[PDB]
RNA sequence: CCCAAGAGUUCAUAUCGACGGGGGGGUUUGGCACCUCGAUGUCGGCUCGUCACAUCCUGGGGCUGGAGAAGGUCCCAAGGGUUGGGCUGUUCGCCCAUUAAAGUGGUACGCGAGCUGGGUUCAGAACGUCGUGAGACAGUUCGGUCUCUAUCUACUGCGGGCG
RNA sequence: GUCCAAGUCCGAGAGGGAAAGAACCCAGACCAUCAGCUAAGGUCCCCAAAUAUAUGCUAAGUUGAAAGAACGAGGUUUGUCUGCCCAGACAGCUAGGAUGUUGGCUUGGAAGCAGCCCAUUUAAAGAGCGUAACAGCUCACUAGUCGAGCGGACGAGC
């Protein structure tokens, strides 16, 4: 999981979600596309 | 689950399987229950044990009246234990039998006082420099006690020279070897704080 | 020999759900840790 | 809103009562309780009408949340949910002694679990295939929690595939 | 300059409440005086004892 | 009790007489090395025929110490000179002879090769 | 940190990333000259510590161009620990042997009414070079006095009075 | 910081406010008084005066002193334009997804997917993954289900 200041969908199956007031990019099929910090 | 004893001396025995073992003799005489503090009048469950009886001359009228509600009379060492194993009432006696062979105890005692000791013997500081390479008068000096204008004060807790003395220390699980009950012996393995003929609190 | 981890659930009074309490014990001492 | 404006018609045989904040559902598999706070739920006798008062970004979600919770409790205590785990790998063993599961994985010990009396527990390890454990309960939340804390004992590796997985539920695999 | 007024007896202090998430996000600082001795409590922990 | 900058006598037929201690292996800030402890040494005599050269760096074990060392039974051993035996790159002794007696504490540390060819133990 | 031409067998973001841009910190060299020239003692080392985390080890995880073991990168975390020598006045640096590791910094580049004076800026002498000369050198070498009885506060200990 | 020009203030200036600040805001102190009205700034308590009224926003303790970026986001309120819609809007579920043809050039191999360049049946069919090339999965599209909103662009406030 990488920490970036500007998260964006690195694919078409990624999902942007908000956990505890923090943006995450989750992709269960390709777990190397995980980001946070919004 | 608790007793009072007197440190007799120190010797060395041999285990049943070779090796030598240093040991300390604790004449843990029969203690007597003086007052049982319950959870209704005081606020916690405990009971006092008295160890060594006094005379009718040195004792106070208050102490005489306090121990008259009990069996044996005014004691030299009275200390309050907590969380015993068997529910017992006033006047009962506990000689040595509360300990077994192979158990662990937490002897507590008052160390012997060293008096006013410097930092080298109290905290373990080492010198200021060498002994001859220009050393003038600071062979046993503390050195510096703080920094410059920030914070412009000596921090609380700075290790300096003071009365080393003897406080209460626990020995943390000494192993019991001999629990002879006829003559109160309680031979344990290890050291014990304090000089000879000093009172110690043996917590089981 | 070999130890045995016994995981038993209980109704915690701090919330009301089903928590999990595991502990490494002897293979023949798991019966006394599951009845309590 | 859209999922909350739907009826919760009951498969007759199960009753639902409401209290001062607590809703209870009694069927053929034990009572189930739930606590609602910002929704008005009324049982007419056949359908259960749950509605909201304001649209303030929180009640609009609590409406559907409590509707789905009540529907789940019903389609539970009435019928009940069930799930299946499957142990994949060499030397993996699973045994059942009632409400007590015994798992033998590649660890240096075994794992015995005293599953709560509110969840059934069956096992199938017939000859050589992968041992299949099956749980069944009326509480879907507790069922899923038990299944999760059983699966967490050994996560499915991506290279081979060994691990406590569900039946079906294809895994992400790599080359290695 | 005179101690006028009354004596107040609050009789339900255990039943007081805070508005937002202050019971979980209110901190009390209790520096002791020793280097590195700044202790921080919480509104939830402080009401657990007295 | 042998530490850095300590001169020892090599007791074997490997081809050295006197050696100098460089390090006491077995942890950070380790002070001394009694019998049975491993040390790093540098040869300083290198007998003419020899099998080792003067200036090489090797590893050895302390065999005899002048400091009285205590056992579990309560007894003590105290030799008259600080001696050591060189070791191979692995945990093995180089050579086939050992001069003078050795300590029994060298047996609890699996130095059977060194203890099985000494005059006295 | 932002964009991503590429490099990565193909695949920008496992890993690195040019051409450009936006900020945080005040530990380096600077800019200003604002308090001190009826004196704020300057480098290095010793003793004593204390603080921040921008974490070297131990602790918990995500991804992998992760078969396992060893790795690479990122995230959370300051409780404890973080070696001894050769050379040099050295900070720094190189080397030798270990260790789980041999962290980065601040506190008047911490600390000289705590220590040393090895270096630097005192008076002597000599070398290279400049100057006709007296003399000088961010050139080198040998030698060369470090003052004070603790009042207030700040610390480490021990007592008397009163409540 | 420094050097000029047009003003004000300190210098040589008391008093009130910003918690404490020579210059910032108000305001130019002849004395005395246990009198009143106001400026800046404020009216829950420390500390004089509104726990005053009317309307809306914020959920971050943002904020209640001053002061922040390139670049992200399905936080929320609000104005205009704007397409799809009971002849059935978006999502979900089920099924179909062809033929000339494996289009032509090149390539040992290019068959919709190394690179370049229409027709027929229909409710509809287009000359991403992967395979040495095929194959196969998926997508564009259409058919049935429930039946009411589904979205974009330009702004403005927090």
From Swiss-Prot, chain F:
InterPro entries: Ribosomal_uL14, Ribosomal_uL14_bac-type, Ribosomal_uL14_CS, Ribosomal_uL14_sf. It comes from the Bacteria. Pfam families: Ribosomal_L14 (PF00238). PROSITE patterns: RIBOSOMAL_L14. GO terms for biological process: translation. SMART domains: Ribosomal_L14. Keywords: Ribonucleoprotein, Ribosomal protein, RNA-binding, rRNA-binding. SUPFAM superfamilies: Ribosomal protein L14 (SSF50193). GO terms for cellular component: cytosolic large ribosomal subunit. GO terms for molecular function: large ribosomal subunit rRNA binding; structural constituent of ribosome. HAMAP family: Ribosomal_uL14. Binds to 23S rRNA. Forms part of two intersubunit bridges in the 70S ribosome. Part of the 50S ribosomal subunit. Forms a cluster with proteins L3 and L19. In the 70S ribosome, L14 and L19 interact and together make contacts with the 16S rRNA in bridges B5 and B8. Belongs to the universal ribosomal protein uL14 family. This is Large ribosomal subunit protein uL14.
